[PDB]
Amino acid sequence: LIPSLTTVILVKSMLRKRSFGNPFKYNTETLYPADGGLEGACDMALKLVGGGHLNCSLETTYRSKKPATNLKMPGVYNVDHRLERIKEADDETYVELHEVAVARYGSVSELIKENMPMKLYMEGTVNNHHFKCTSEGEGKPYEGTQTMRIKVVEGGPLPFAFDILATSFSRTFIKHPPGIPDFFKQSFPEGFTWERVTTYEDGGVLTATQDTSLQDGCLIYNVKVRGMNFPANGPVMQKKTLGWEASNGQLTEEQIAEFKEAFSLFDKDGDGTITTKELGTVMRSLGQNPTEAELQDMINEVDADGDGTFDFPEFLTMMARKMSYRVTEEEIREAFRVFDKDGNGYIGAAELRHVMTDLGEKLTDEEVDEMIRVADIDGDGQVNYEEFVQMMT
Ligand SMILES: [Ca+2]
Ligand SMILES: [Ca+2]
Ligand SMILES: [Ca+2]
Ligand SMILES: [Ca+2]
């Protein structure tokens, strides 16, 4: 099968982020410097039973315990997060959470190693109900991954969804690329604090304070949570939540900006309308050689109003449908074929550079190699189907 239009945008996106990861399945925090700390802003969407979402906004403040003079402040940047549930008890009193966190758009603490363990003590109140959780875990602070095994030890089973505590469970594990100073790793040995206010649509408000420190090679998290004004018959207090959407509900401006460039690639005459001819050059530049009818089938997926072409608003809408949906098994196979131009089953550095050029993206040779090495588990220097699929999941 001829790679689909969305597959092409996927691959383009994977390259923009220099990662064989799924680039769509993330939720974005923006970090701004501010009086020698950082301010974090984020929007998140809790899935309800019966469809629909509960939106909240998070405003976090991050302060370092180290003096101002020993810290290289970053610019403004974003962290992309993907929080997942690997295990649970029915009652949500044992919860194993996995997170992936990557800086976008670094520092090396001698104290922060490639595998770090962590331990957390959480105490708090949600609509005056008292509880306690403990956890232990580990991760790879430079690769951006971590696992936390959580227990509720008092106040359980909780009379509210566990979901509202998820973001209160690890900032040292954010992968920061070389260009971005990592305020979190630089804070040690002393560590850092945060205070967060999450405000929900329906008026529930969850505040939390957190101390991070480092005791003899293990990170120690100490967190205080005060949740209030959650509607007593709402989906939080009645446990009618199905987890956090690993996305944003509407497209951000920077998503619209990103996708406008991906559109420009196709729009060779810049008249705002894409034809089979213009899709044709792009498809052929990726090694396909499709017929007019096949190119038309591809435009038919995008062309709502039936006039044979598509414009930018229809293109955008298709990307929104894909952001609210998910990347499929077929799309992953198609994406691999595209990367693997010579069909030998191995994605090499040279292929990445040809494909990169076909899709109007530019990576340095350090970026090209890091993108491979990260996926490359057998160490032969290339990416095979199995390695690719692991990364994409
Ligand atoms: Ca055009
Ligand atoms: Ca149209
Ligand atoms: Ca190859
Ligand atoms: Ca390999």
* CA 277 / ligand 3 centre spacing (Å): 28
Q: Which ligand is nearest to the CA of 306?
A: 2
Strand, coil or helix: 323: helix
Residues 27/28/34/37 CA torsion (nearest 10 deg): 50
* CA 144 / ligand 4 centre spacing (Å): 20
Rounded Cα–Cα distance for residues 146 and 41 (Å): 22
3-class SS letters over 19-80: CCCCCCCCEEEEEEEECCEEEEEEEEEEEECCCCEEEEEEEEEEEECCCHHHCCCCCCEEEE
Q: Which residues surround ligand 4, an ion (CB under 5 A)?
A: 376, 378, 380, 382
* CA 50 / ligand 3 centre spacing (Å): 45
Resolution in A: 2.4
* CA 35 / ligand 2 centre spacing (Å): 49
Q: Are 222 and 206 in contact (CB under 8 A)?
A: no
Q: Which ligand is nearest to the CA of 374?
A: 4
How does DSSP assign 332-358, residue by residue? Answer: HHHHHHHH-TT-SSEE-HHHHHHHHHH
* CA 387 / ligand 3 centre spacing (Å): 14
How does DSSP assign 90-101, residue by residue? Answer: TTSSEEEEEEEE
Q: Report CA-CA distances (Å) from 24 to 82, 244, 385.
A: 10, 15, 20
* CA 374 / ligand 4 centre spacing (Å): 10
Phi/psi class of residue 54: alpha, beta or left (left: φ > 0; alpha: ψ in -120 to 50)?
beta
Structure tokens belonging to residue 94: 């044992």
- By CB neighbour count within 10 A (0-12 exposed, 13-18 middle, 19+ buried), where does 196 fall? buried
What residues contact 14, with CB distance under 8 A and at least 6 apart? 20, 21, 23, 335
* CA 207 / ligand 3 centre spacing (Å): 51
* CA 380 / ligand 4 centre spacing (Å): 5
What is the CB-side half-sphere exposure of residue 193 using CA atoms within 13 A?
9
Q: If you ran DSSP here, which 8-state letter would residue 172 be given?
A: G
Q: Which ligand is nearest to the CA of 352?
A: 3
Name the structure determination technique: X-ray
Domains along the chain with CATH numbers: 1-246 (2.40.155.10), 247-393 (no CATH)
Q: Which ligand is nearest to the CA of 347?
A: 3
* CA 338 / ligand 1 centre spacing (Å): 24
Q: Report CA-CA distances (Å) from 337 to 7, 198, 333, 342.
A: 10, 43, 6, 9
* CA 387 / ligand 4 centre spacing (Å): 7
* CA 333 / ligand 1 centre spacing (Å): 29
Q: Which ligand is nearest to the CA of 390?
A: 4
Strand, coil or helix: 142: coil
Q: Which of 349, 342, 393 is nearest to 371 (CA)?
A: 349
* CA 284 / ligand 1 centre spacing (Å): 17
Rounded Cα–Cα distance for residues 121 and 223 (Å): 6
Q: Which ligand is nearest to the CA of 340?
A: 3
* CA 315 / ligand 2 centre spacing (Å): 9
Rounded Cα–Cα distance for residues 244 and 329 (Å): 22
Rounded Cα–Cα distance for residues 368 and 10 (Å): 17
* CA 340 / ligand 4 centre spacing (Å): 13
* CA 342 / ligand 3 centre spacing (Å): 5
Q: Which of 339, 346, 357, 344 is nearest to 381 (CA)?
A: 346
